[PDB]
Amino acid sequence: GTSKLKYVLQDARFFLIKSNNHENVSLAKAKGVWSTLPVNEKKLNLAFRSARSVILIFSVRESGKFQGFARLSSESHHGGSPIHWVLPSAKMLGGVFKIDWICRRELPFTKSAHLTNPWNEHKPVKIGRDGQEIELECGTQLCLLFPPDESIDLYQVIHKM
């Protein structure tokens, strides 16, 4: 292991990402991309310039779980290869962020019930709107709860910091 993981998470910022379907998280895991509404796009871009690592923690609505977490590797950009998200229009979305997955394993909410987010009224960290920032200590402990993803090598992520 957890040492490189702790290094990547040192002084990071964390954001809760809530997807309404599994297809979008699967696309993000396969293509290394995410897109969000402009209100959150602006917050993530500010965060990306402000911190060594910005971590997105993903949860599919109604799943009772987180599906993993990833680190922003770019600010949002437009153009690019289109992404066939399952939308609840594509013009309403902001740009596309490139992301590097740190863990593609799931974590059930039952395992994070002891973690509260000060930036959301100390409600359990599972609770929050899409884009809710997670305070540093809560976010770090939440990431450390995930099962280790032995498919990922954090060596290349570290070099991007």
From Swiss-Prot:
Tyrosine phosphorylated. Residues 12-146 form the YTH domain. It is found in: Nucleus; Nucleus speckle. Its main location: nucleus. Changing F58D: Does not affect ability to influence alternative splice site selection. The keyword Nucleus applies. The modification Phosphoserine is found at S81, S89. Changing F66D: Abolishes RNA-binding and ability to influence alternative splice site selection. The keyword Cell division does not apply. GO terms for cellular component: nuclear speck; nucleoplasm; nucleus; plasma membrane. Regulator of alternative splicing that specifically recognizes and binds N6-methyladenosine (m6A)-containing RNAs. M6A is a modification present at internal sites of mRNAs and some non-coding RNAs and plays a role in the efficiency of mRNA splicing, processing and stability. Acts as a key regulator of exon-inclusion or exon-skipping during alternative splicing via interaction with mRNA splicing factors SRSF3 and SRSF10. The YTH domain mediates RNA-binding. This is YTH domain-containing protein 1. It comes from Homo sapiens (Human). The gene is YTHDC1. The chain holds residues 345 to 507 of 727 of the full protein.
